[PDB]
Structures are given as structure tokens and as C-alpha cells.
Amino acid sequence: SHMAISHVQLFSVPVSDQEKAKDFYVETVGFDLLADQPGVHGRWLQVAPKGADTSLVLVDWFPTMPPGSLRGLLLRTDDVDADCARLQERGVAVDGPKNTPWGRQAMFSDPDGNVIGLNQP
Amino acid sequence: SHMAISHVQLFSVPVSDQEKAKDFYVETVGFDLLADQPGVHGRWLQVAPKGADTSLVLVDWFPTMPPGSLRGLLLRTDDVDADCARLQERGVAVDGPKNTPWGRQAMFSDPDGNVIGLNQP
Numbered sequence: 409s410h411m412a413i414s415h416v417q418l419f420s421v422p423v424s425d426q427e428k429a430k431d432f433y434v435e436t437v438g439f440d441l442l443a444d445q446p447g448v449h450g451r452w453l454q455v456a457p458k459g460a461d462t463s464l465v466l467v468d469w470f471p472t473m474p475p476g477s478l479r480g481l482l483l484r485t486d487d488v489d490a491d492c493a494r495l496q497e498r499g500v501a502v503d504g505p506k507n508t509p510w511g512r513q514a515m516f517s518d519p520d521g522n523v524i525g526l527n528q529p
Numbered sequence: 530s531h532m533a534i535s536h537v538q539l540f541s542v543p544v545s546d547q548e549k550a551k552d553f554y555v556e557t558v559g560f561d562l563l564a565d566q567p568g569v570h571g572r573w574l575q576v577a578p579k580g581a582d583t584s585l586v587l588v589d590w591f592p593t594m595p596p597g598s599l600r601g602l603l604l605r606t607d608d609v610d611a612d613c614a615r616l617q618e619r620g621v622a623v624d625g626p627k628n629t630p631w632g633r634q635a636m637f638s639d640p641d642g643n644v645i646g647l648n649q650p
């Protein structure tokens with residue numbers, strides 16, 4: 409009848425130095441470390457905002473996704489101004505916050521240059 | 530002291546023909562159409578599993594994300610076998626499902642060749 413898909417489980421973020429990316433997403437951005445799993449196929453590094461249904465895999469093994477190539481990623485936050493102040497204190501350049509029709513937004517990049525947005529609806 | 534980020538609001542999937550991509554994600558994969566609006570950089574086309582927190586935007590304006598370049602996107606399903614049967618019936622070529630250490634998983638491609646996974650843990 410209808411599909412049994414509930415949500416996006418995860419998607420991939422292309423990085424170079426995975427240790428550097430781990431420290432960034434976990435320590436600086438504040439995500440939980442869900443898994444850090446070396447194996448035959450590479451190091452599976454998985455992170456998410458605490459309690460979030462959809463997680464991020466910090467991957468270096470997809471040739472069609474060069475490190476730092478990701479754009480158009482937006483994180484929902486309940487306090488964009490406080491998050492921007494924290495990021496700035498933690499050594500991250502933040503563009504914003506700014507008001508938009510869809511919420512108050514800010515932009516920053518990770519160590520490889522992937523572009524990450526924040527939005528407080 | 531802790532970040533106020535709750536979850537990924539949305540992320541971007543690089544497509545060429547947005548109308549074809551819309552029809553694929555909505556009609557074939559069963560997502561809801563949240564938005565289809567004129568935007569600053571192009572047509573803002575936003576889709577998501579029904580009821581889900583994180584949505585996908587089907588974009589054509591990021592030169593670092595060529596159409597069909599995306600990998601490592603996995604959808605959580607409560608019935609991977611039934612979903613694969615629906616996808617086959619709808620004309621999609623599916624690889625799997627098979628049991629893995631990480632769950633019961635299948636893979637398929639969208640019209641541009643972005644690679645999309647299904648997983649039932």
C-alpha cells in the first residue's frame with residue numbers, strides 16, 4: 409500500500425582528516441558521538457545532535473563527494489543567538505545571525521569547508 | 530554551556546531535472562511535498578518522509594555538488610522488504626535487501642544517480 413519509511417536515518421558529510429572532523433562536530437558544534445567504527449571499508453564516524461532521529465556520517469570514501477564540497481545543510485536550533493556566541497567563543501567564524509522569512513539564521517564552515525547553517529524558526 | 534541545536538532541519542540533494550526529481554521522491558518513494566517555491570538561487574523544492582523532522586531540498590545550484598553525486602543517504606524503514614517490493618513495482622532497480630552487521634539494507638538510485646539506501650535495524 410504505502411511506504412514504511414519513517415525518516416532519513418543518516419546522510420554523509422565529506423571530510424578529509426576524520427580525527428579533526430570528529431573533534432569539530434563533537435567538541436565544537438556539540439554533537440553526540442554515536443559511533444566510531446574502523447573496519448575493512450574505512451572508519452565509520454557517526455555524529456548527531458543529542459536525541460536527533462537523523463545523524464551525520466563523517467566520510468572520506470566517496471570520490472563523488474570531495475572533502476568540503478557539501479552545501480545546503482541547516483541545523484534547527486532553539487537559540488541561534490546563544491549558539492552563535494558559543495561558536496564564536498569556541499573559535500569559529502560565524503556569518504550572522506540574520507532574520508529571514510523562515511527564521512533567524514547563521515552560517516559557518518567546518519575544517520574542510522563544508523557549509524553549515526543554523527536556523528531558529 | 531551546551532549548544533541549543535536540536536536536529537538537522539534539512540539537507541540538500543543535487544538533482545538536474547527538479548520536476549522529475551519531485552515526482553520520484555513524492556510519487557515513487559512516498560515522501561510528502563512540503564514546499565515548491567521560487568527562491569533566490571532557484572526553485573526551492575522540499576520533500577520529507579511523512580511526519581519526519583529532517584527534510585531534503587532538491588537543488589541544482591551548488592557547483593560543488595554535481596547532480597547525481599550524492600552517496601551515503603540512508604532511510605529508516607519499518608519494513609524494508611515490503612518497501613523494496615513497492616519500489617520494484619514502481620520501476621526502480623533495487624540492490625538487496627540483505628542482512629548486514631548494521632541492519633537489513635537495500636540500495637537504489639534516483640533519476641540523477643544519487644544513491645539512496647533503505648535500512649531496517
Ligand SMILES: Cc1cc2nc3c(=O)[nH]c(=O)nc-3n(C[C@H](O)[C@H](O)[C@H](O)CO)c2cc1C
Pocket residue numbers: 482508510511513527538564566567568569570573
Ligand atoms: C522551512 C524552510 C523553508 C525555506 N523555504 C525557502 C523558499 O521557499 N525559498 C527560498 O529561497 N529559501 C527558503 N529557505 C532558506 C534558503 O536556505 C535561502 O535560499 C537562504 O537562506 C538564502 O540563500 C527556507 C528555509 C527553511 C528553514
Ligand SMILES: Cc1cc2nc3c(=O)[nH]c(=O)nc-3n(C[C@H](O)[C@H](O)[C@H](O)CO)c2cc1C
Pocket residue numbers: 417445446447449450452600601602603631632634646648
Ligand atoms: C547504524 C549503522 C552503522 C553502520 N556502520 C557501518 C560501519 O561501521 N562500517 C561500514 O562499512 N558500514 C556501515 N554501515 C553501512 C552503511 O549504511 C552503507 O554501507 C552506506 O550508508 C551506503 O554506502 C552502517 C549502517 C548503519 C545503519
